[PDB]
């Protein structure tokens, strides 16, 4: 039997990576290019919709629309669970990982109170994995997962300490079906990493929830994606594995029917999957 719905939400503060970013990596990289910072590149790029790493709004944007909430989206494409970003060249300019986004949010508050009604949405860890695999991290994956789990738990603790009361923490996504991961022959490594994160993190967050009297909801994005991919026609999906918009090794023409595709590029879901994700996230809350 389902539980009672959670109380309504009128403000979201979102923290995370390219699965949430609604314009920050574009703002920041435009700024860094204006200033000639070393190694700066225009992100996300020309084949993306309005600075999102997709062809439409991210899940958290749809969540906020569903719930009737305003959204302050702090997420930065590339963000890791710690201080920094998949893009190493950002570090000298700004710490845009989850820990840096939390630092910057608390610094903006003047010492002024956290909104105890706002939902603090956290969705990160993919880039921990992508950076480890793309640049030959040597940390065993089990230790990398441990680090991601500790980093997310510390972010919840630090936001809670400052006065946050309501959380929604997204699990790892199914990195094992990401087209870049398939092409790198890294399906088993992604499986092992995401299973470790998703087994450990909810145990840690529930202990924190209880200690600090928080409301903290866990969104299992792996169960979400497995249900969609097992029954694609129910949602109007046709192509689960090919990127609609290939970028590697070069940019090719977008597919004719993007709403029938799971993946936009080699890492990111399409607007359709973000819409279904945001609707699924919204299901635990009253409007």
Show the helix and strand layout:
Elements: E1 11-16, H1 24-34, H2 59-67, E2 70-73, H3 98-108, E3 119-123, H4 126-134, H5 141-161, E4 166-170, H6 179-183, H7 187-212, E5 215-219, H8 221-230, E6 239-243, E7 261-263, H9 271-282
Parallel strand pairs: 1-2, 1-3, 3-4, 4-5, 6-7
Helix pairs in contact: 2-9, 3-5, 5-7
Give the termini distance in whole angstroms. Answer: 20 Å
Structural class: alpha/beta
CATH superfamily grouping: SGNH hydrolase
Q: Under the CATH scheme, which architecture would be assigned?
A: 3-Layer(aba) Sandwich
H/E order of the elements? EHHEHEHHEHHEHEEH
CATH class, anyone? Alpha Beta
Number of strands: 7
Biggest sheet record:
5 strands, parallel
What overall geometry do the principal axes of the alpha carbons give? globular
Summarize the structure.
The protein has 287 residues and is α/β, with parallel strands linked by helices.
Structure description:
- It is a single chain.
- It is built from 9 helices and 7 strands.
- With 287 residues, it is an alpha/beta fold.
- The protein has one domain (11-282): SGNH hydrolase (Rossmann fold).
- The strands form 2 sheets. Strands 2-1-3-4-5 form a 5-stranded parallel β-sheet, sandwiched between helices. The chain has a two-stranded parallel sheet with strand order 6-7.
- α3 (98-108) packs parallel to α5 (141-161) and α5 (141-161) packs parallel to α7.
- It is globular.
- It starts with 10 loop residues before the first strand and ends in a 5-residue tail after the last helix.
- It is classed as hydrolase.
- The entry lists the keywords esterase, hydrolase.
- It forms a monomeric assembly.
- Crystal structure of ChoE with Ser38 adopting alternative conformations.
